[PDB]
Write a protein that holds these residues in place. Structure first.
Motif, PDB file in Angstrom:
ATOM      1  N   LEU B  47      -9.911  -3.268 -17.586  1.00 15.33           N
ATOM      2  CA  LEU B  47      -8.496  -3.167 -17.277  1.00 15.33           C
ATOM      3  C   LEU B  47      -8.161  -3.954 -16.013  1.00 15.33           C
ATOM      4  N   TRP B  49      -4.783  -4.233 -13.181  1.00 17.12           N
ATOM      5  CA  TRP B  49      -3.491  -3.724 -12.744  1.00 17.12           C
ATOM      6  C   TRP B  49      -2.563  -4.878 -12.385  1.00 17.12           C
ATOM      7  N   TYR B  52       3.205  -1.559 -10.231  1.00 19.30           N
ATOM      8  CA  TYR B  52       4.143  -0.489 -10.528  1.00 19.30           C
ATOM      9  C   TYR B  52       5.362  -0.590  -9.622  1.00 19.30           C
ATOM     10  N   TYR B  60       5.574  -2.677  -6.096  1.00 22.59           N
ATOM     11  CA  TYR B  60       4.254  -3.015  -5.584  1.00 22.59           C
ATOM     12  C   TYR B  60       3.549  -3.906  -6.595  1.00 22.59           C
ATOM     13  N   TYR B  61       2.971  -5.000  -6.116  1.00 20.41           N
ATOM     14  CA  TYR B  61       2.353  -5.999  -6.972  1.00 20.41           C
ATOM     15  C   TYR B  61       0.849  -6.053  -6.734  1.00 20.41           C
ATOM     16  N   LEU B 106      -0.468  12.139  -2.644  1.00 15.69           N
ATOM     17  CA  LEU B 106      -1.141  10.870  -2.903  1.00 15.69           C
ATOM     18  C   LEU B 106      -0.687  10.363  -4.266  1.00 15.69           C
ATOM     19  N   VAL B 107      -0.961   9.090  -4.516  1.00 17.61           N
ATOM     20  CA  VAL B 107      -0.764   8.507  -5.836  1.00 17.61           C
ATOM     21  C   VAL B 107      -1.959   8.870  -6.709  1.00 17.61           C
ATOM     22  N   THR B 109      -3.246   9.598 -11.250  1.00 17.48           N
ATOM     23  CA  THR B 109      -3.553   8.994 -12.539  1.00 17.48           C
ATOM     24  C   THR B 109      -2.304   8.498 -13.260  1.00 17.48           C
TER      25      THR B 109
ATOM     26  N   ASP C  31     -10.526   8.186   0.681  1.00 14.99           N
ATOM     27  CA  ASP C  31      -9.158   8.025   1.155  1.00 14.99           C
ATOM     28  C   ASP C  31      -8.143   7.977   0.021  1.00 14.99           C
ATOM     29  N   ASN C  32      -8.585   7.717  -1.208  1.00 13.65           N
ATOM     30  CA  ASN C  32      -7.693   7.661  -2.357  1.00 13.65           C
ATOM     31  C   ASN C  32      -8.340   8.378  -3.532  1.00 13.65           C
ATOM     32  N   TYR C  33      -7.500   8.807  -4.469  1.00 13.64           N
ATOM     33  CA  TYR C  33      -7.983   9.506  -5.649  1.00 13.64           C
ATOM     34  C   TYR C  33      -8.708   8.549  -6.589  1.00 13.64           C
ATOM     35  N   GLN C  35      -9.900   8.192 -10.689  1.00 12.63           N
ATOM     36  CA  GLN C  35      -9.609   8.692 -12.022  1.00 12.63           C
ATOM     37  C   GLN C  35     -10.500   8.008 -13.049  1.00 12.63           C
ATOM     38  N   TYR C  50      -9.049  13.400 -13.381  1.00  8.04           N
ATOM     39  CA  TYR C  50      -8.086  12.941 -12.392  1.00  8.04           C
ATOM     40  C   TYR C  50      -8.204  13.795 -11.138  1.00  8.04           C
ATOM     41  N   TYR C  90     -13.448   4.174 -17.748  1.00  6.66           N
ATOM     42  CA  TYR C  90     -12.981   3.304 -16.678  1.00  6.66           C
ATOM     43  C   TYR C  90     -12.686   4.126 -15.432  1.00  6.66           C
ATOM     44  N   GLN C  92     -10.943   4.293 -11.926  1.00  9.14           N
ATOM     45  CA  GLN C  92      -9.816   3.654 -11.261  1.00  9.14           C
ATOM     46  C   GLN C  92      -9.468   4.404  -9.984  1.00  9.14           C
ATOM     47  N   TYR C  94      -7.312   3.546  -5.812  1.00  6.87           N
ATOM     48  CA  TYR C  94      -6.245   2.811  -5.148  1.00  6.87           C
ATOM     49  C   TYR C  94      -6.730   2.271  -3.812  1.00  6.87           C
ATOM     50  N   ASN C  98      -1.800   0.319  -1.247  1.00  4.42           N
ATOM     51  CA  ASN C  98      -1.149   0.786  -2.472  1.00  4.42           C
ATOM     52  C   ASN C  98      -1.358  -0.208  -3.614  1.00  4.42           C
ATOM     53  N   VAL C  99      -2.616  -0.581  -3.826  1.00  4.04           N
ATOM     54  CA  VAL C  99      -3.016  -1.480  -4.902  1.00  4.04           C
ATOM     55  C   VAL C  99      -3.994  -0.729  -5.793  1.00  4.04           C
ATOM     56  N   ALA C 100      -3.642  -0.584  -7.068  1.00  5.52           N
ATOM     57  CA  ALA C 100      -4.503   0.126  -8.004  1.00  5.52           C
ATOM     58  C   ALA C 100      -5.747  -0.699  -8.304  1.00  5.52           C
ATOM     59  N   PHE C 102      -9.128  -0.993 -10.511  1.00  8.55           N
ATOM     60  CA  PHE C 102      -9.803  -0.573 -11.728  1.00  8.55           C
ATOM     61  C   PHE C 102     -11.269  -0.984 -11.692  1.00  8.55           C
ATOM     62  N   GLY C 103     -12.111  -0.168 -12.323  1.00  2.47           N
ATOM     63  CA  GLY C 103     -13.523  -0.458 -12.414  1.00  2.47           C
ATOM     64  C   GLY C 103     -13.828  -1.547 -13.423  1.00  2.47           C
TER      65      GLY C 103
END
Lengths: 50, 212, 213
Positions: B47, B49, B52, B60-61, B106-107, B109, C31-33, C35, C50, C90, C92, C94, C98-100, C102-103
């Protein structure tokens, strides 16, 4: 229930997208499970949902 | 329940702008506590990103292609749109909608994903494939079909007598290459008359080639 | 730029326990979640773990997530495999900007049939193919059950990176997987170079076969 087996009750299986609430599907087209769709009879990863 | 659905052209060409839009049902796009993202998945890769966007306009890019993406939101139709720029042959992938949860501390899933749309980037529109024999060296031998535009492939071995046709992949030139093969118990069986025929589905054009 | 790296393929016999872990390199994992999305081949991904410790309703309790702060990694414990657990997982998270993130993706499968050593079918360019001013070197690898399809190209002395068009793992008619390692090379390069190699390295066993004019 009938001893000779029931063939008048069927159920759709493996739809590509989840239905919305209160929705019915009539089209009996085959479902593509893989990446190779079948145009005629069903086959591997292209079976019939009924 | 809440569900998403992609919508847009399933086939584009380079030097253009890939435009998509996701129709949201079961929920309002003007609702906060949720971002509306776009996830990219090339065929055979993981995947990726894209970005969003919050309903307040905060978009956010992804730093990889931030200068070639754009996201919008429409509170009336409950649809958020995606707009890339300067698409290339490597930008073809399966784009999935996703709603991220920004509710607690937090942000989190992407709770609900769409059905996913598969789009391809290619400037060509009509091209006939070419067959090539494959000499063996238990042995393996077959045919080599390359440079065909349409997605559906028609493979025929021995006029139906059987096969793991090796489904092609979008190469760097924006085309595909078929390498369906068969097996033989020995090199003596390879001398028999074996035929590998393919059919151009959108053109109804058949191609024949003698292989041995 | 925070990244996540996870193993490419994980395989274990049913009724046993597997472990898929993603390690953050350029940043912290706490520092971030984090999933985990179980993506079944041919369908959209679906959340199974999650908030690093929570599982959605309806997902079987066979899945559980963990966080290791000492090693800066996030693992996924799946005990009691099943037939439908052959999907990809997968990991995932952040980034701080604020950038997601992914694995890389991990293909998990149950060991139904015994594992077999892969086969190599290195094929040189054909006569008409050479007349078409193209090489099209392929490696129609076959006879391997696990989804650990890997392709490592190598020339006579130098590595090869351009032209790699390895396809997804495709199953044969005899319930077994096989793949193709495409490669497009300039005929001048095929005439100048001596030979090439198509290293598979399936399930650790570095099966290697070369091809020369």
């Amino acid at each position: 229930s009938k001893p000779s087996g029931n063939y008048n009750y069927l159920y759709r299986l493996l739809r590509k997208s989840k239905l919305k609430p209160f929705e019915r599907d009539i089209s009996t087209e085959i479902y593509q499970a893989g990446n190779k769709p079948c145009n005629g009879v069903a086959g591997p990863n292209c079976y019939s949902p009924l | 329940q809440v569900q998403l659905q992609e919508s847009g052209p399933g086939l584009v060409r380079p030097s253009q702008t890939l435009s998509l839009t996701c129709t949201v049902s079961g929920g309002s796009v003007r609702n906060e506590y949720y971002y509306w993202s776009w996830i990219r998945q090339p065929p055979g890769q993981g995947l990726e990103w894209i970005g969003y966007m919050h309903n307040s306009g905060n978009t956010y890019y992804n730093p990889s292609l931030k200068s070639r993406v754009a996201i919008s939101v429409d509170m009336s139709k409950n649809q958020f749109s995606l707009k890339l720029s300067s698409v290339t042959v490597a930008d073809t992938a399966v784009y999935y909608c996703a709603r991220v949860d920004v509710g607690g501390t937090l942000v989190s899933t992407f709770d609900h994903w769409g059905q996913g749309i598969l789009v391809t980037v290619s400037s060509a529109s009509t091209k006939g494939p070419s067959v090539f024999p494959l000499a063996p060296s238990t042995a393996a031998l077959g045919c080599l079909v390359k440079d065909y535009f349409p997605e559906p492939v028609t493979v025929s071995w021995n006029s139906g007598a059987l096969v793991h046709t090796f489904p092609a992949v979008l190469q760097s030139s924006g085309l595909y290459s078929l390498s369906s093969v068969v097996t033989v118990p020995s090199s003596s069986l390879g001398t028999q008359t074996y035929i590998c025929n393919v059919n151009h589905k959108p053109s109804n054009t058949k191609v024949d080639k003698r292989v041995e | 730029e925070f990244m996540l790296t996870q193993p490419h393929s994980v395989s274990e016999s049913p009724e046993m326990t597997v472990t898929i872990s993603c390690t953050g390199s350029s940043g912290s994992i706490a520092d971030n979640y984090v999933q985990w999305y179980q993506q079944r081949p041919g369908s959209a991904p679906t959340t199974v773990i999650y908030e690093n410790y929570q599982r959605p309703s309806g997902v079987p309790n066979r899945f559980s997530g963990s966080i290791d702060s000492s090693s800066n990694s996030a693992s996924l414990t799946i005990s009691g495999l099943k037939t439908e657990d052959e999907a990809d997982y997968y990991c995932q998270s952040y980034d701080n900007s604020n950038v997601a993130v992914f694995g890389g993706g991990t293909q998990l499968t149950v060991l139904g049939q015994p594992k077999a050593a892969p086969s190599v079918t290195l094929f040189p360019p054909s006569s008409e193919e050479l007349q078409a001013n193209k090489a099209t070197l392929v490696c129609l690898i076959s006879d391997f059950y696990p989804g650990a399809v890997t392709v490592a190209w190598k020339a006579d002395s130098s590595p090869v990176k351009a032209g790699v068009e390895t396809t997804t793992p495709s199953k044969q008619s005899n319930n077994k997987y096989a793949a193709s390692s495409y490669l497009s090379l300039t005929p001048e390069q095929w005439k100048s170079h001596r030979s090439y190699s198509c290293q598979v390295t399936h399930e650790g066993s570095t099966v290697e076969k070369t091809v020369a004019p």
